[PDB]
A paper describes a structure:
FzlA is an essential FtsZ‐binding protein conserved across α‐proteobacteria. Depletion of FzlA leads to cell filamentation, but leaves Z‐ring and divisome assembly unperturbed, suggesting that FzlA is required for active constriction. In vitro, FzlA not only binds to FtsZ, but promotes formation of stable, double‐stranded helices containing two highly curved FtsZ protofilaments. Importantly, FzlA appears to play a key role in determining cell constriction rate through its interaction with FtsZ.
To this end, we expressed an N‐terminal hexahistidine‐tagged version of C. crescentus fzlA in E. coli. Subsequent data processing, phasing, model building and refinement produced an electron density map at 2 Å and the corresponding model was of very good quality. It was possible to resolve residues 3–228 of FzlA and the asymmetric unit contained one molecule (Supporting Information Fig. S1 for stereo view of a portion of the structure). Based on sequence homology, FzlA was classified as a member of the GST protein family in C. crescentus. FzlA does not bind glutathione, however, and lacks the catalytic histidine and serine/cysteine residues found in other GST proteins, suggesting that it no longer retains glutathione transferase activity. Applying crystal symmetry revealed that FzlA is most likely a homodimer (interface area 1263 Å2 as determined by PISA). Residues 212–228 at the C‐terminus do not show any secondary structure, but are still ordered. Mutation of one set of residues (D109 and E122 [FzlAWB1]) weakens interaction with FtsZ, while perturbation of others (W38, R124 [FzlANB1] and E119 [FzlANB2]) completely eliminates binding. In addition, we identified residues (P131, L136, R137 [FzlANH1], R140, E141 [FzlANH2] and R144 [FzlANH3]) that when mutated, retained some ability to bind but were no longer able to curve FtsZ filaments. Satisfyingly, these residues map to the same face on FzlA's surface.
Author numbering: 3 to 228
Write the structure that this text describes.
């Protein structure tokens, strides 16, 4: 199968797909999309206008898989090597719960403040961050970090004994916040240790190489020691 991933580098959803494909050693070509500019041609691929979109081609027939709910389940169903969902129903349920936790709750309570006020406003030339919005995002982030810390002191990985899509979801989201220097790793020891381990995996390497014009990452962003 040929794979083309239409994505935006600093998008957590996109990064989850890049981590899953990398971890499964599935090659893909990438096409970067400035989706906020609503390029007509991308909206013809995905009517929501949002990345990521994975196009799988086999014998010149295309399967256009849009956004993470469809993409991640497709990957896990069709490429078992290695599994990013556990075998026990409880581990599968817990990982999926955590996918939803990050894609909805974390995205709303943290990203809607920290990523909106800094990255999105910059890209749309809408001016400076609202400092109160930033303070609200930072406090929400600390509450989410505390939650994952409590999990990681009781489990090896977020969803239990096996590394899963839940780890990649949390790490994808945190990696973008980390690019903008906003994660207080020093205060959450189990979470710091967990991220350091994820960040050193081969699948993470391209993500650490991400750079976008006008958006200069924190100095430690691509350091394996931080």
């Amino acid at each position: 199968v040929e794979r083309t991933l239409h994505h935006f580098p600093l998008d957590p959803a996109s990064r989850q797909v890049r981590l899953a494909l990398g971890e499964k050693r599935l090659p893909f070509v990438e096409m970067q999309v400035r989706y906020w500019e609503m390029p007509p041609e991308f909206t013809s691929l995905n009517p929501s206008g949002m990345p990521p979109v994975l196009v799988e081609t086999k014998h010149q027939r295309n399967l256009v898989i849009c956004e993470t709910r469809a993409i991640l389940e497709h990957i896990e169903e069709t490429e078992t090597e290695p599994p990013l969902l556990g075998r026990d129903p409880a581990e599968r349920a817990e990982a999926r719960r955590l996918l939803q936790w990050f894609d909805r709750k974390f995205d709303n309570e943290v990203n809607g403040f920290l990523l909106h006020e800094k990255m999105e406003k910059r890209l749309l030339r809408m001016g400076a961050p609202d400092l109160a919005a930033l303070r609200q995002g930072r406090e929400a982030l600390r509450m989410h970090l505390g939650y994952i810390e409590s999990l990681l002191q009781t489990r090896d990985w977020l969803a239990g004994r096996r590394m899963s899509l839940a780890d990649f979801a949390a790490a994808a989201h945190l990696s973008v916040i980390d690019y903008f220097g906003d994660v207080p790793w020093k205060d959450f020891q189990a979470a710091k240790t967990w991220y350091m381990k994820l960040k050193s995996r081969p699948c993470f390497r391209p993500i650490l190489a991400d750079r976008w014009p006008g958006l200069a990452p924190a100095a430690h962003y691509d350091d394996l020691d931080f």
